[PDB]
Amino acid sequence: REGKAQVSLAQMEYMLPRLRGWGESMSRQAGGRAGGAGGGVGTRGPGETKIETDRRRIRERMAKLRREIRDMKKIRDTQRGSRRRSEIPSVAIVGYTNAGKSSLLNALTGAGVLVENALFATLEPTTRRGEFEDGRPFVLTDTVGFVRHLPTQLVEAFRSTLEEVVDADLLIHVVDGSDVNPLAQINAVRTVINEVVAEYDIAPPPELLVVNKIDAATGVGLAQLRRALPDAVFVSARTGDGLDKLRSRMGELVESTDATVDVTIPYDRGDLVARVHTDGHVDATEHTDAGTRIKARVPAPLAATLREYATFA
Amino acid sequence: MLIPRKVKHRKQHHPEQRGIASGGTSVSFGDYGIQALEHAYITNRQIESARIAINRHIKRGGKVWINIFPDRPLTKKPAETRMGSGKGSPEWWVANVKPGRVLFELSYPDEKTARDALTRAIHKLPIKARIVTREE
Amino acid sequence: MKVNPSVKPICDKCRVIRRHGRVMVICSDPRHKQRQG
Amino acid sequence: LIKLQIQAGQANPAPPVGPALGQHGVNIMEFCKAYNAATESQRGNVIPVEITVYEDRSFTFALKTPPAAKLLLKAAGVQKGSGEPHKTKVAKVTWDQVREIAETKKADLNANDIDAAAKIIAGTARSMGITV
Amino acid sequence: PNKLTANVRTRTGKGASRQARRDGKVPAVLYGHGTDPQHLELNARDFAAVLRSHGTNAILTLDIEGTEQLALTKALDVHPIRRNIQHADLLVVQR
Amino acid sequence: AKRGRKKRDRKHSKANHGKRPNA
Amino acid sequence: MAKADKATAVADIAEQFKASTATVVTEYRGLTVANLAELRRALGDSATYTVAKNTLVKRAASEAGIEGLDELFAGPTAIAFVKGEAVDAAKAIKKFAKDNKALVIKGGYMDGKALSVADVEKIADL
RNA sequence: GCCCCUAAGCGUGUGCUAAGUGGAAAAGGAUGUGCAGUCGCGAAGACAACCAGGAGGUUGGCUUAGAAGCAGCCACCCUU
Ligand SMILES: Nc1nc2c(ncn2[C@@H]2O[C@H](COP(=O)(O)OP(=O)(O)CP(=O)(O)O)[C@@H](O)[C@H]2O)c(=O)[nH]1
Numbered sequence: 005r006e007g008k009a010q011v012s013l014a015q016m017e018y019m020l021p022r023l024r025g026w027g028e029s030m031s032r033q034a035g036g037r038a039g040g041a042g043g044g045v046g047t048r049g050p051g052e053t054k055i056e057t058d059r060r061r062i063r064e065r066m067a068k069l070r071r072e073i074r075d076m077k078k079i080r081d082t083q084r085g086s087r088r089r090s091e092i093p094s095v096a097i098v099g100y101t102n103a104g105k106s107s108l109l110n111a112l113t114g115a116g117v118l119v120e121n122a123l124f125a126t127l128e129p130t131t132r133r134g135e136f137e138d139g140r141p142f143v144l145t146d147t148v149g150f151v152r153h154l155p156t157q158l159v160e161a162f163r164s165t166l167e168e169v170v171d172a173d174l175l176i177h178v179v180d181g182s183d184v185n186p187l188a189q190i191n192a193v194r195t196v197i198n199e200v201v202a203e204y205d206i207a208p209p210p211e212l213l214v215v216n217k218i219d220a221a222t223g224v225g226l227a228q229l230r231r232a233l234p235d236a237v238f239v240s241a242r243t244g245d246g247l248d249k250l251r252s253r254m255g256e257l258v259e260s261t262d263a264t265v266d267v268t269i270p271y272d273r274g275d276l277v278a279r280v281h282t283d284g285h286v287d288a289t290e291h292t293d294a295g296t297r298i299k300a301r302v303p304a305p306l307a308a309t310l311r312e313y314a315t316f317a
Numbered sequence: 318m319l320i321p322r323k324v325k326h327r328k329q330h331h332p333e334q335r336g337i338a339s340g341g342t343s344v345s346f347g348d349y350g351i352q353a354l355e356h357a358y359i360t361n362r363q364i365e366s367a368r369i370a371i372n373r374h375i376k377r378g379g380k381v382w383i384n385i386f387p388d389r390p391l392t393k394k395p396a397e398t399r400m401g402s403g404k405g406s407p408e409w410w411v412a413n414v415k416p417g418r419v420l421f422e423l424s425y426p427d428e429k430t431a432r433d434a435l436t437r438a439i440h441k442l443p444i445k446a447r448i449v450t451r452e453e
Numbered sequence: 454m455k456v457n458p459s460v461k462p463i464c465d466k467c468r469v470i471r472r473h474g475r476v477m478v479i480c481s482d483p484r485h486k487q488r489q490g
Numbered sequence: 491l492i493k494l495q496i497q498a499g500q501a502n503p504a505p506p507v508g509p510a511l512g513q514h515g516v517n518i519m520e521f522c523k524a525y526n527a528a529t530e531s532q533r534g535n536v537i538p539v540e541i542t543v544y545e546d547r548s549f550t551f552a553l554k555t556p557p558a559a560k561l562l563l564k565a566a567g568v569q570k571g572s573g574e575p576h577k578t579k580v581a582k583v584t585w586d587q588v589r590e591i592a593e594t595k596k597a598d599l600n601a602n603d604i605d606a607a608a609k610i611i612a613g614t615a616r617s618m619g620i621t622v
Numbered sequence: 623p624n625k626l627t628a629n630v631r632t633r634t635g636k637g638a639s640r641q642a643r644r645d646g647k648v649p650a651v652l653y654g655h656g657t658d659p660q661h662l663e664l665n666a667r668d669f670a671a672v673l674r675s676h677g678t679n680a681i682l683t684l685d686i687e688g689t690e691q692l693a694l695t696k697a698l699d700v701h702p703i704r705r706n707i708q709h710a711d712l713l714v715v716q717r
Numbered sequence: 718a719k720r721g722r723k724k725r726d727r728k729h730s731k732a733n734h735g736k737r738p739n740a
Numbered sequence: 741m742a743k744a745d746k747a748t749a750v751a752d753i754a755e756q757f758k759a760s761t762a763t764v765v766t767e768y769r770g771l772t773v774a775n776l777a778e779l780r781r782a783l784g785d786s787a788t789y790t791v792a793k794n795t796l797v798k799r800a801a802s803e804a805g806i807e808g809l810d811e812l813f814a815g816p817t818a819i820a821f822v823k824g825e826a827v828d829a830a831k832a833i834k835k836f837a838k839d840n841k842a843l844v845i846k847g848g849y850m851d852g853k854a855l856s857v858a859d860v861e862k863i864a865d866l
Numbered sequence: 867g868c869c870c871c872u873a874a875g876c877g878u879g880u881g882c883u884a885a886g887u888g889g890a891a892a893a894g895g896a897u898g899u900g901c902a903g904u905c906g907c908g909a910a911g912a913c914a915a916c917c918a919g920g921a922g923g924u925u926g927g928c929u930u931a932g933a934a935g936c937a938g939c940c941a942c943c944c945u946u
Contacts, residue, residue, distance in 0.1 A: 271512030291505035342702035417702025613944035
């Protein structure tokens with residue numbers, strides 16, 4: 005429902021300048037052509053109206069759509085509050101479309117999102133849980149898709165994407181390795197990143213780099229030339245090759261807000277042992293006479309909990 | 318969706334919504350059918366909605382039989398126009414369902430799941446309906 | 454409280470009752486506390 | 491009070507015992523070394539004990555033997571149990587020897603019926619999912 | 623076996639048939655190689671009972687007027703809306 | 718739509734036998 | 741009880757009633773499985789104690805042909821119906837009322853032909 | 867049309883409604899109530915209720931630091 009209003013608003017805002025002439029031209033041409041569009045309905049509906057024609061009607065529907073999009077932002081803030089309050093470490097996956105942006109999120113975690121071959125299909129951001137291989141959990145978000153000279157009426161349809169980009173720690177621009185000029189996508193994606201960090205002033209987040217579809221690539225560089233951006237990980241989502249290296253380096257590059265301490269716990273208070281073993285990601289220990297030499301990257305709630313039962317060894 | 322490939326006459330009169338059905342009042346292809354108890358013009362979009370709901374509830378097994386076909390064209394005068402100056406262009410495809418006619422049939426091994434799928438499809442239709450079974 | 458024209462059981466422990474001329478789903482879980490209009 | 495099946499290991503076992511005994515009150519060393527004295531005769535499988543705490547220092551030891559549910563597992567050479575119980579059977583054991591060596595474990599079974607207690611043991615084995 | 627009881631019809635037509643159906647009496651015709659159409663009004667709900675118990679391919683006893691005649695149902699007539707038995711065709715059977 | 722709805726329900730009456738002028 | 745399944749157990753208990761030698765109509769209240777199984781293994785096959793539905797067993801003991809102890813089926817009757825012995829197999833059976841404090845024997849009638857409120861403290865005990 | 871306004875029944879005989887329904891309304895929701903069925907259980911005591919037991923192999927196994935009926939998996943057995 006959100007998309008069927010944003011797309012319609014974008015089409016109305018693109019067609020409003022060009023009403024006379026062209027607009028009446030597709031008013032005359034009503035067969036469901038390429039310009040026939042359809043709005044968010046897709047299966048015509050307002051497709052028989054295409055982008056509408058009347059400026060009065062366009063203006064009215066535009067005002068209603070503005071109000072509705074206003075509502076579906078105080079909906080989205082509510083839906084994201086739980087993540088915000090818990091401050092789970094968020095990782096987002098951006099890049100050019102058809103660059104394995106959804107296959108990666110179906111690969112690292114068994115999400116199961118649509119992976120159609122065509123262009124922009126994951127048009128609504130979806131996020132899924134995940135565990136960094138060694139320690140902390142995380143959340144993973146795949147975005148919509150970027151294009152060279154992106155339309156200027158689609159920024160609202162991309163607004164939720166932009167919000168996910170800003171509210172992130174590790175940004176991931178996935179580049180389609182087996183494609184001509186694997187850098188043209190990169191410059192456009194980066195430029196989108198700068199306009200985002202400018203429109204919403206924030207410290208830019210680290211940008212993790214991954215080259216995808218290198219299984220079918222003919223090595224366009226086949227060398228440090230293939231290291232056209234030398235910092236990157238060459239994953240193959242179709243085969244799951246760099247998953248281990250990606251799953252390792254992505255966590256190591258997210259930064260840890262833990263608190264590694266060494267604490268001992270007398271057996272009576274096994275509650276603390278269980279809480280460290282289920283919340284804190286203990287490295288290891290030896291099972292001591294009365295307690296344990298637990299070396300756990302314990303978090304803030306339990307940091308002061310385990311301060312009393314500390315140890316010096 | 319569903320559409321006739323060719324129609325002899327594109328602009329027709331309105332289908333007659335009178336009398337109970339005379340043919341198609343029985344489950345003949347499946348095991349559970351959705352009979353109709355009211356008169357309705359059931360459009361192709363409603364048929365696709367019901368079909369998708371049925372095919373997504375069971376989601377694996379059994380066939381779905383859509384007896385009716387939306388071949389009658391319904392026209393629509395263009396907006397903000399005064400009355401007159403010819404009949405409008407075709408806009409809707411309808412099937413002139415009649416009470417007693419079975420609109421959908423289904424055959425799934427699990428009986429209650431099929432019953433619930435038919436219930437979940439009845440909600441997409443503009444009229445009353447009931448679950449009818451091949452075992453009379 | 455969920456004032457909807459359609460009130461249904463949602464979980465295994467929802468009971469539908471007629472109280473003061475109104476249909477209510479009373480459940481141990483407060484999230485399922487639904488009252489018909 | 492606790493029918494804990496303390497492991498047969500006579501080489502440094504409290505941590506495993508220390509939790510289960512520090513949630514209550516019993517001498518850790520006394521309990522450990524008395525169970526270790528029992529294991530001096532019981533090195534097969536760690537025999538079970540029911541420590542009967544009343545208010546302090548229960549000092550009670552009764553034997554119920556360790557992997558009865560898998561005495562068959564222990565006395566076949568096959569380990570890891572069976573992670574696919576009845577999906578496919580895992581391992582091979584002898585059908586006569588279960589009926590025979592059910593004698594040792596019949597000391598705490600339900601009934602004295604021979605073939606039926608053998609079926610008890612066959613049930614505990616087939617719980618893994620294995621042929622016997 | 624099925625032991626149905628049948629009665630002949632004194633009035634035929636639309637009005638009489640609806641009146642018979644209003645009193646739980648499904649009208650029926652007895653015909654076959656007997657070469658004589660017998661207009662019968664069969665009491666209802668027991669016709670339905672035997673049809674559900676055995677099926678259409680059954681053998682109705684049909685004690686008409688104290689005279690037994692074995693028959694088999696050949697053609698029914700259910701209303702599409704109010705599923706009932708509007709009329710049943712009975713084929714004569716001679717032993 | 719209250720006014721027209723009332724003026725149309727007015728026909729459903731014993732004395733009017735279910736049909737009124739301008740119904 | 742179970743209209744079809746009832747008669748099978750009624751007949752089984754009845755035939756064991758007429759086959760046996762005596763009766764002790766007893767109270768099984770509060771019998772935790774431990775002590776109850778200790779009893780089942782103490783008397784063993786002889787007097788094989790197994791509770792049966794009192795309402796049905798009234799007709800079951802009559803199915804065997806005998807009456808009597810049927811009079812006092814009020815409460816949760818428990819039956820042993822000793823197989824071979826009379827005195828030596830009833831000592832512990834009666835004295836479980838002293839040891840476990842359970843199995844107070846209402847009794848009332850021996851073998852189906854001899855009434856006695858002393859059903860246990862009779863020859864069965866002495 | 868017949869309780870008063872307002873002429874004539876606060877009629878008689880059987881039932882139903884608690885909503886002022888009567889004295890506006892839909893998809894749909896619903897332990898409202900009556901009537902006619904059918905099917906299951908049950909005086910060998912059913913259903914509710916109260917008093918007891920509710921066992922052992924056993925903590926079934928895998929799993930995990932740990933999962934012992936009750937993270938979660940397979941089986942979903944053996945005896946009394
Ligand atoms: N051969 C091969 N194909 C891949 C690889 N990674 C992704 N693809 C292909 O990319 C295609 C596009 O699917 P998707 O994963 O959605 O790419 P995308 O970038 O997310 C397209 P969108 O942005 O609209 O979600 C898929 O058909 C998938 O098969 C890879 O490593 N090797």
